[PDB]
Amino acid sequence: VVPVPREQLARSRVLVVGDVMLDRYWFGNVDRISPEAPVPVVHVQRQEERLGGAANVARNAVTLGGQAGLLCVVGCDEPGERIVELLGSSGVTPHLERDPALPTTIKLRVLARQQQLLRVDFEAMPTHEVLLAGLARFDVLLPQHDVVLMSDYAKGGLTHVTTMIEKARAAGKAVLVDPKGDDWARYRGASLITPNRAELREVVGQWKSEDDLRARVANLRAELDIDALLLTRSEEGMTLFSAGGELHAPALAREVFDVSGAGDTVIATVATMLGAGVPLVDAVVLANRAAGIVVGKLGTATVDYDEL
Amino acid sequence: VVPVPREQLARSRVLVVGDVMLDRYWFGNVDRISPEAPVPVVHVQRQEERLGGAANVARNAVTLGGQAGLLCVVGCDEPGERIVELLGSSGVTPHLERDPALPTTIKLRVLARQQQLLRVDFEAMPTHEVLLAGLARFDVLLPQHDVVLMSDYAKGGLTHVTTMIEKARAAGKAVLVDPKGDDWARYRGASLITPNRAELREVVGQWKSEDDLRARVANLRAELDIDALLLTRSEEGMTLFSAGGELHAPALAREVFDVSGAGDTVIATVATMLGAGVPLVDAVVLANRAAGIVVGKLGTATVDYDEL
Numbered sequence A, B: 001v002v003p004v005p006r007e008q009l010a011r012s013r014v015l016v017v018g019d020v021m022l023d024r025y026w027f028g029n030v031d032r033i034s035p036e037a038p039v040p041v042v043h044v045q046r047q048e049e050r051l052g053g054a055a056n057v058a059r060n061a062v063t064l065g066g067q068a069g070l071l072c073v074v075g076c077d078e079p080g081e082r083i084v085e086l087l088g089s090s091g092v093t094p095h096l097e098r099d100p101a102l103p104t105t106i107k108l109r110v111l112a113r114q115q116q117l118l119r120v121d122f123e124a125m126p127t128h129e130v131l132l133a134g135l136a137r138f139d140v141l142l143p144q145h146d147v148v149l150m151s152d153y154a155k156g157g158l159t160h161v162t163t164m165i166e167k168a169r170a171a172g173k174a175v176l177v178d179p180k181g182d183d184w185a186r187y188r189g190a191s192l193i194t195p196n197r198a199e200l201r202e203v204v205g206q207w208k209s210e211d212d213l214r215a216r217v218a219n220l221r222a223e224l225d226i227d228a229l230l231l232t233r234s235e236e237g238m239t240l241f242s243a244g245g246e247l248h249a250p251a252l253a254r255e256v257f258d259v260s261g262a263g264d265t266v267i268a269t270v271a272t273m274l275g276a277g278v279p280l281v282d283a284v285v286l287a288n289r290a291a292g293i294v295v296g297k298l299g300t301a302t303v304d305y306d307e308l
């Protein structure tokens, strides 16, 4: 893949819509058992914060050189404020609905001696009113972006994904979907869906060969009006199933240290590349190179254009 | 014990000096295992906050009808701000040194299905400068209180306890010490020390009888210039060892649900009573009645005057 001039990537406009998250990590020591319960006491010494979910997708898009808008819902709380701050220092243009009744989604990991003891989650469902308000922002934002990205984590932020996909594909805007759950009918009309092996199994069942997989993916795309499917297979790399044929990029990384934000980085890379008007085939290749860097990296991460 | 007119309790001035804490409780559900580690994911649904440590001691003093000042150190953070707020709504007169480099001590319990999975602690040592600043406040506050209470949790807030005890006993002010650790020489000159069975063992060793205990306590008080010792014995009640004789109050509560703030409530009750100019013997009795209520109570709690 030849270089795409930074001036060209800079004109790539990606609208990220989905479930925003704040990844928080508490590192501490465990020297004793609680006096109230047969459980450890963690004396926390340091904290670590990363943008998660759609936010990480969006920030991955800007580090490559592209532009990213973020349409999502947050609460009126400190994690929500932290996300705003982190979005600001990461060049992501925010478009945030605020639900005071909603807790900002935050994934808190607790660690000691370099292992997790627990994960603590705060999350809920945005109100009916708030979601319809975001849908209005979508109509306004849609003409201002070359490509739309749907980052789904089943947190409620994509309840109106179907209508959003229709509006965008009518506008000639390419639509990418990072899926969650098995009910995929909601994703119909998408230009590209990006599941991993586990996610695809719940929809179509276990394949018995590459042919069996190739056939199931083919059925899945016709019955769901989806143009292409990018299957991420970890150790087996990733395989694109488009109408113009297939493409397989073997896993370039040998050592894998942490797999958070892997999927985020992949779909973000393709989107930014597609927004820059580059071929889906090259977009898929670069997405896999990016995925191989992000894996050999602790916590949710990002890649620059040169690293590719 | 005959009632002490509320007008008399209202004139009881207690200076609480020590380690302030914020008890925080996260209640949630556990439906799955983390994708990163063989550990639970807690989806937290509700939070609970109580004043802890010296703060709980101080708030126990005001609910009985007495007055309480709180001399302590907090950080410049949200738990520190919460303590200020909770102190305000609980009538405790604050005297707080602020160390921005210090994390406010907060004890965070995580629960699901009504059991603890982990306790997360944030705490550190106040700076040399800050502690000496508090010592100055002590000299100013000392003439304004009838009795001083030292609530020790080995968090650094009582590094200058020895000098404080000297200053107070010179001023004719009664001094009470809720101990922590085994190095008790620092507590010398105190009017009353209030350990439980476990705390006393590390200092003097296991007794073989009441006589063996009576003898060890006697030695401990002469070698340490301490007037009286209040030993809290859980199921065995509590026994006062003063120079004017002994007093034993059997445990009045049969069901024990949570033991947090038990020790806090006991020493706080005695102090407020002593501040109101009531006999140590009656003070000890009422402290045990209060302890029997506070045990049949979830989390750190308080008692009113009538409940006694």
Ligand SMILES: COc1cccc(OC)c1-c1cnnc(NCc2nc3cc(OCC(=O)O)ccc3s2)n1
Pocket: A196, A198, A232, A233, A234, A235, A236, A237, A238, A250, A251, A252, A253, A254, A255, A256, A259, A262, A263, A266, A288, A291, A292, A295
């Ligand atoms: C997530 O990636 C890995 C995961 C495990 C082992 C691996 O190689 C030994 C990889 C790996 C290493 N180097 N490159 C690649 N690229 C192909 C990809 N496979 C996946 C699989 C993904 O799903 C993660 C999940 O299961 O949630 C997400 C992104 C990619 S990207 N994968």
Ligand SMILES: COc1cccc(OC)c1-c1cnnc(NCc2nc3cc(OCC(=O)O)ccc3s2)n1
Pocket: B196, B198, B232, B233, B234, B235, B236, B237, B238, B250, B251, B252, B253, B254, B255, B256, B259, B262, B263, B266, B288, B291, B292, B295
């Ligand atoms: C903490 O109190 C109990 C603890 C366990 C069983 C109990 O009775 C069956 C009691 C209990 C019940 N009713 N009254 C009393 N009063 C005597 C006291 N014993 C202790 C013991 C304490 O130490 C707690 C600790 O070990 O940290 C603190 C306060 C008191 S007050 N104690």
Ligand SMILES: O=P(O)(O)OC[C@@H](O)[C@H]1O[C@@H](O)[C@@H](O)[C@@H](O)[C@@H]1O
Pocket: A021, A022, A023, A051, A052, A053, A054, A056, A107, A153, A260, A261, A262, A263, A264, A300, B035
């Ligand atoms: O477990 P659920 O709630 O489905 O997802 C949240 C986490 O598992 C992580 O997901 C990863 O992909 C990342 O996006 C990361 O930011 C996030 O914390």
Ligand SMILES: O=P(O)(O)OC[C@@H](O)[C@H]1O[C@@H](O)[C@@H](O)[C@@H](O)[C@@H]1O
Pocket: A035, B021, B022, B023, B051, B052, B053, B054, B056, B107, B153, B260, B261, B262, B263, B264, B300
């Ligand atoms: O365990 P360490 O750090 O020594 O004490 C903190 C806790 O154990 C609890 O102590 C109890 O008495 C109470 O004062 C309560 O507020 C506090 O959280």
Ligand SMILES: [Cl-]
Pocket: A049, A050, A051, A086
């Ligand atoms: Cl970040």
Ligand SMILES: [Cl-]
Pocket: B049, B050, B051, B086
């Ligand atoms: Cl409180």
Ligand SMILES: [K+]
Pocket: A258, A259, A260, A261, A262, A294, A295, A296, A297, A298, A299, A300, A301
């Ligand atoms: K990573």
Ligand SMILES: [K+]
Pocket: B258, B259, B260, B261, B262, B294, B295, B296, B297, B298, B299, B300, B301
């Ligand atoms: K209690």
